A paper describes a structure:
Aurora A is a serine/threonine protein kinase that plays an important role in controlling early stages of mitosis, including centrosome maturation and separation, mitotic entry, and bipolar spindle formation. Localization and enzymatic activity of Aurora A are regulated by its interaction with the spindle assembly factor TPX2. We have used fragment-based, structure-guided lead discovery to develop small molecule inhibitors of the Aurora A-TPX2 protein–protein interaction (PPI). The initial fragment hits identified from screening with the ATP site blocked by a high-affinity inhibitor were very weakly active, but guided by continuous crystallographic analysis of the inhibitors in complex with Aurora A, we were able to increase target affinity by more than 10,000-fold, clearly demonstrating the ability of fragment-based and structural biology approaches to develop potent PPI inhibitors when a suitable binding pocket is present. These compounds occupy a hydrophobic pocket on the surface of Aurora A, discrete from its ATP-binding catalytic site, which forms the interaction surface for a linear N-terminal segment of the interacting peptide from TPX2.
An early modification was to change the phenol group of 2 into indole while replacing the trifluoromethoxy with a smaller chlorine to give 3, which improved the KD to 1.26 μM. The indole-aryl core of the molecule lays in a hydrophobic pocket assembled from Leu169, Leu178, Val182, Val206, and the side chain of Lys166. The indole nitrogen proton forms a hydrogen bond with the side chain of Glu170 thus mimicking the phenol of Tyr8 of TPX2. The carboxylic acid group was observed to interact with Lys166 and His201. Furthermore, the electron density supported it being twisted from the plane of the indole ring in order to form a salt-bridge with Aurora A. Our analysis of ligands in PDB and CSD45 databases shows that carboxylic acids are more commonly in-plane with the aromatic ring (data not shown) and presumably this twisting incurs an energetic penalty upon binding.
Numbering used by the authors: 126 to 286, 291 to 388
């Protein structure tokens, strides 16, 4: 349970974070490969997010699902906080999308099924992820999707305040929100997986804000009827109008292309 930096051999950086970096690491005694998320105390204090960090730790450490990234523990020293995470060897869904440009209907529907199942488990504990995006979706050794970065995670309902690309209208506007925010994020993902870019993508935060607020998006011609139907059902301005995850999992386009 009590760890120290001296218990780990540090490898290359795995990625850059908002409050520090993620490094590959090996526990000296067991030779267990893992990821160490290193955060700077000064930066967290200045941002006034030292309690949201405690929330990320508390929420993620109690989740057990094959499509959710494990958080084994944490420790800290005079300047830094260290989160001990499960290593996701095939990287981010973000990098996969950058090299493939777009995913086919089968890969998309499979990822959407994996997400819906992980989100269903979260929502059963009244946990809202609120930061579902390709760079927070990691790939296990078998290429299985793993929800990661519980940095902004909270318990529903919440009226608590990167790009806005995956945030629903109620979360922007700083209004009260529940588990329905993750259903909106799911529709933005589905679109991005098939099209290569999120539906409200813009040059500025200001322009993206407006597009989300208006639910202003169009589909390229290659997007099928079934895909258009599922996305359009998820991207409802009214959170109450968004379907349950059970409905997403039973959608004909999902059942026909997954897995
Ligand atoms: N367990 C992990 N295995 C592999 N890469 C990881 C892991 N955790 C994070 N990363 C990489 O580091 C990046 C930043 O990690 P993350 O927890 O998402 O940080 P932040 O809250 O700053 O955005 C990720 O997008 C990813 O590229
Ligand atoms: O004890 C401390 O002295 C302490 C502690 C923390 C801290 C916060 C969250 C977690 Cl999960 C672990 C440690 C932080 C975060 C910023 N300044 C700190 C000081
Ligand atoms: O883990 C982190 O980098 C942060 C902890 C504090 C809240 C915000 C969070 C994040 O950016 O994901
Ligand atoms: Mg992240
Ligand atoms: Mg984060």
């Amino acid at each position: 349970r009590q760890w120290a930096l001296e218990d780990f051999e540090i490898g290359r950086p795995l990625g850059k974070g908002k409050f520090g970096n993620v490094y590959l690491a090996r526990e000296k005694q067991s030779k267990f490969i893992l990821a160490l998320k290193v955060l700077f105390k000064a930066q967290l204090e200045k941002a006034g997010v030292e309690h949201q960090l405690r929330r990320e730790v508390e929420i993620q450490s109690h989740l057990r699902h094959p499509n959710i990234l494990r958080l084994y523990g944490y420790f800290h020293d005079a300047t830094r906080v260290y989160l001990i995470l499960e290593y996701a060897p095939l990287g981010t869904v973000y990098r996969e999308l950058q090299k493939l440009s777009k995913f086919d209907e089968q890969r998309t529907a499979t990822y959407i099924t994996e997400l819906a199942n992980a989100l269903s488990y979260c929502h059963s504990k009244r946990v809202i992820h609120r930061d579902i995006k390709p760079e927070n979706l990691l790939l296990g050794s078998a290429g299985e999707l793993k929800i990661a970065d519980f940095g902004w995670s909270v318990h529903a309902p919440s009226s608590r305040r990167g790009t806005l690309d995956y945030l629903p209208p109620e979360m922007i506007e700083g209004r009260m929100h529940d588990e329905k925010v993750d259903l909106w994020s799911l529709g933005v993902l589905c679109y991005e997986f098939l099209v290569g870019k999120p539906p409200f993508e813009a040059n500025t935060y200001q322009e993206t804000y407006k597009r989300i607020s208006r639910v202003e998006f169009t589909f390229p011609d290659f997007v099928t009827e079934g895909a258009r139907d599922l996305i359009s059902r998820l991207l409802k301005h009214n959170p109450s109008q968004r379907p349950m995850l059970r409905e997403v999992l039973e959608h004909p386009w999902i059942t026909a292309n997954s897995s």
